[PDB]
Symmetry: D2
């Protein structure tokens, strides 16, 4: 199943879409700078692009910086949308945040550690917006339908599934390349995407991204952490593999 996001078609059998950007919003100026580089690079490559950022990092240390918060963050997003004419994605943590975020941000994201906060799921669903579901590391590819079931029960079917690795012993993540196919089969062929950045915690990034896309995915999710100047060389290679894979009929 495909999902229109303004002009972009996101589907497992459509050219891959890049979800990319910073980790958290810090300034209007820093955000515009990084997004211009993301846009300028993606536009020349002809890769549909969606800008990602967090307005709050609620898992941060007690005395560390957490973000600009919701109010100013949304304004930053309005300006990004205005200047580049692209869709944006951000994560939501509290039910009450869902509607005000949804009016600005085309894609709202459910954090992996929160997949089972029922109230948040319902408030995200009410919005009618496109949802990105981060698969928790402790969840098997086929249990992913349980969360998909919940959004359908809440009346929203415009969902993307996001792989970010599976828990492997202590303090380590493996990505089961077969998971992508299982999520596709059990969840009605909703768009699946690969968060390669988070899957890497604990050259490598490229191998992983490439392997993931070989299985035939809707999109690639990343933070930049990756350098730029390498973002272009990096994506050139992804585009080349994605083109090839997508040009071959399924089966």
């Amino acid at each position: 199943m495909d999902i229109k996001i303004n002009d972009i078609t996101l589907g497992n059998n459509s050219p891959f879409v890049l979800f990319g950007g910073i980790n958290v919003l810090e300034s209007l100026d820093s955000t515009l700078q990084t997004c211009a580089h993301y846009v300028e690079v993606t536009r020349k490559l002809g890769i549909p692009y969606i800008f990602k950022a967090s307005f709050d990092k609620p898992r941060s240390s007690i005395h560390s910086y957490r973000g600009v918060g919701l109010e100013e963050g949304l304004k930053i997003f309005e300006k990004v949308k205005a200047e580049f004419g692209i869709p944006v994605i951000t994560d939501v943590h509290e039910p009450h945040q869902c509607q005000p975020v949804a009016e600005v941000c085309d894609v709202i994201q459910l954090p992996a550690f929160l997949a089972r906060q029922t109230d948040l799921v319902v408030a995200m669903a009410k919005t009618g917006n496109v949802v990105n579901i981060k698969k928790p590391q402790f969840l098997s590819p086929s249990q992913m339908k349980n969360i998909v079931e919940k959004f359908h029960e809440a009346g929203n079917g415009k969902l993307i599934l996001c792989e970010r690795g599976s828990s492997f012993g202590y303090d380590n993540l493996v990505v089961d390349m077969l998971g992508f196919g299982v999520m596709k089969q059990t969840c009605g062929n909703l768009p699946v995407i690969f968060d390669v950045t988070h899957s890497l915690q604990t050259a490598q990034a490229l191998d992983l991204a490439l392997a993931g896309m070989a299985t035939r995915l809707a999109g690639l999710f990343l933070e930049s952490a990756l350098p730029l100047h390498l973002l272009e060389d990096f994506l050139i290679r992804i585009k080349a593999l994605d083109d090839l894979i997508k040009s071959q009929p399924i089966l």
Copy 2:
């Protein structure tokens, strides 16, 4: 390090404390009848006991009953304390719930999926009450220290760690019996309790084996979410008496 909860001494060198009750609070009459059974068996064997329930928890399904809520829950708790003169324990999900819940409930529980949530940790710490931290399944015993550090900076030292199991491949949980010892060394020998029920996802034969294994490592308490109970508690008590009556190994 010992924690006085009213007249109960909870600590890894103290007779084990049973934590048990119901999943979600329905009514006063339903709560009293179930608590009564627990209180009868525990008193019959002289086992210190703490009643457990949720006033408001997210569930398996969207429209599953979350519980009577804060206001009616606290009244139910107050009567249970009045009735049986025992400590109670409940979970909190929102910073705002912490202060009024802490007025009634001797121990407050941090849900596993919210463990890294700084705002909630602060709110729970600021209460000054005994806090139970539920260990996420995708977390290693060595990184529980980080959650423990967060509580100390926020000014609360009165903490219980609660083992619930670790991810073991897909759709499985294993309890690493070495984990218990690692939490003691690395976190100042805080009270550790073993949540046997959620560790298990006949099955009573199995709950026993697991419970006995845990308690052989020498632990502050036992955590259930389940006459059949008596014969069970007889065996835990036997083992806990034997273990707690021997000095820890000599340096």
Copy 3:
């Protein structure tokens, strides 16, 4: 099901048996010294004891001591049996090793990784001796029935199942305490023992907590390679004694 090993009764509801000795044999002299130590300790605690050692060490680096080897090793075992009148256990890696080893050793052991190899299974089974089957670290407890089933097909049912941990990510082992029960329920309550030594990889304390957690499930025996051994055993016995006096539910 109980197994008579000479005068020792090994079974999931009998007093636990200690298995232990040295990693690998080097000389008659230091071997007799270690064995004497174990017999001294277990005797005064009243714990049955089977002495364990390898004669070969085949995964070692090429330039390293691999051990005394088979002809010499059995000679040391013969003299260990003569000196102390105890049973012994050792491991075999090649089908031809089996029979000569079985002449001397009461229990012969199938290394976990060789559990696959049917030839060795067959050769081990034809000796008639008591076999210790280590559980491969990637195998589920319930899959032990298949190997047990192989030994029954080869005509030997005097089998002890041995737990040594499971693979847990890279370079790590966890011991799943429910495994013991699953194994006891699926393999007809054959003796189950616990190799805590290899289940591991301050600390000597990790061994006790592990042994204690394991023995609390109710097991036939245990493996263990100023007085740390007796300090350990005193506690293990107290636990085993308590657990084995409870009726089975």
Copy 4:
């Protein structure tokens, strides 16, 4: 590092090589038919191809057919080599087997469970033959160098590393796509190949094969859906040709 297996060039930066054939050698005519189809498809696509089978692999049951054996096995290989002019690969389990096998076979294989038995590594090393080393499922990728060092000490540097998955909970395997990179960096960029058949435990095989070869590999290892092979190799070749044509970043 490039390995010349006869006229074939095998390396992480060469066009991928296909290791393919049957599980166990059962008969002469049957073997030649399967190999005929593999050769037919591969020559048709210009993929270098090496034939694979065992003559003695232990099986799930103790009495299931292990294979034709060493004597007849080597004769069947002689016959495949004569008829098709292609190289062959087989596995070996005993030190004494290494020599008779290496005289006929172009690549000898060390089965994963045996991968740390030094006697066998040394006997393999001493042949001077090309060696395929299966990674054991319970070993981490950065521990391969230890096996690689053992081979070097014994005087053989012409080694292939073969991925077949890692233990992931009970009775389940996962392929860590980062394992290939780690092996390249730590073992001197030796040829790495991917055994998807044993990695599984289909559309899956294809997906796994493609993910695998996306990371840039010397070859692909598989057993036999025997006619969808052409359609399958069409896709693998496509991806491999694309990847291989770009320089390493």
